[PDB]
């Protein structure tokens, strides 16, 4: 698993990258009230979103990640903070269902599907993980990002290259950490996402813009966020059966 070589550097990135506050705000905006809900946190990393969802009153939280090292970090954080989260090592594209939840949170899952067939498999796994009145909240790569229109290094992600891959694109990148931490991701088109969503059985969905706010703009020089707004690497997505 790629993040077996990243480990704690990902949390370092979340503490230093300018984009992180925006993605975190956007995801919790999409989630809304979690009181009493059962929650499945996919591509959970060290568990950030599932853990904070628990802190905000969810009834039961389960996290899944492909990286054994990241899950060992997640488990240690749950010990450190005395919380009841449970974790599993799985490739979400190939995993058995672990139950039907009120909410699936997938922050940076689908941009790691390494083929359009695996993108479609992941959406089907998510649908199988939801109650009929549940919802998927996802955060992924914006299909319209183009490397030539501006890199994201100033916001925490140095995108190194861009190459056709299947019906989409693949990108090598690094988180801007000390030292930088390399990873790869996949940029699937809006049409392929919407097809995967519908074919998995989600009859409702919407793309959600990143919630850049006035105070973000005020605390940087004018124009700092222009590449973020004109060539955004990220987007939210909410889907409902
Ligand atoms: N196919 C797959 N199935 C499950 N997890 C995956 C995956 N491909 C990548 N990942 C995991 O996705 C994570 C992306 S980093 C994001 C972590 C967390 N959602 C957060 O935002 O804080 C990594 O921990 C990586 O190991």
UniProtKB/TrEMBL annotation:
Alphabetical GO biological process terms: methylation
Gene Ontology molecular functions: methyltransferase activity
Pfam families per UniProt: Methyltransf_25 (PF13649)
InterPro entries per the UniProt record, alphabetical: Methyltransf_25, SAM-dependent_MTases_sf
Record-given protein name: Methyltransferase
Organism listed in the record: Burkholderia glumae
Residues spanning the signal sequence: none
Superkingdom of this protein's organism: Bacteria
PANTHER family in UniProt: TRANS-ACONITATE 2-METHYLTRANSFERASE (PTHR43861:SF1), TRANS-ACONITATE 2-METHYLTRANSFERASE-RELATED (PTHR43861)
Residue span(s) of domain Methyltransferase: 39-134
Binding site residues for S-adenosyl-L-homocysteine: 20, 65, 91-92
Keyword Transferase listed: yes
Keywords: Methyltransferase, Transferase, Ubiquinone
Record's keyword annotation contains Methyltransferase: yes
């Amino acid at each position: 698993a790629r993040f077996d070589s990243i480990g704690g550097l990902f949390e370092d990135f979340t503490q230093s990258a300018a984009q992180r506050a925006i993605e975190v705000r956007t995801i919790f905006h999409m989630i809304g009230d979690v009181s009493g809900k059962s929650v499945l946190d996919l591509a959970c990393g060290f568990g950030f979103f599932g853990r904070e969802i628990y802190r905000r009153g969810a009834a039961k939280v389960v996290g899944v990640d492909i990286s054994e090292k990241m899950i060992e970090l997640a488990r240690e954080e749950s010990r450190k903070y005395g919380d009841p989260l449970e974790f599993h090592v799985r490739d979400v594209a190939n995993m058995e269902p672990l139950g039907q939840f009120d909410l699936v949170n997938a922050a940076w899952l689908f941009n790691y599907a390494d083929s359009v067939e695996n993108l479609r498999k992941m959406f089907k796994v998510v649908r199988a993980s939801l109650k009929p009145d549940g919802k998927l909240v996802a955060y992924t790569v914006d299909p319209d990002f183009s490397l030539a229109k501006g890199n994201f290094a100033k916001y925490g992600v140095n995108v190194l290259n861009e190459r056709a891959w299947g019906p989409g694109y693949r990108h090598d990148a690094e988180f801007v950490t000390d030292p930088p931490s390399q990873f790869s991701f996949y940029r699937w088109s809006r049409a392929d996402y919407e097809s995967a969503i519908a074919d998995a059985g989600f009859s409702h969905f919407e793309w959600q813009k990143p919630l850049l706010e006035a105070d973000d703009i005020a605390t940087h020089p004018p124009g700092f966020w222009d590449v973020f707004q004109n060539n955004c690497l990220q987007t939210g997505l909410v889907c409902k059966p």
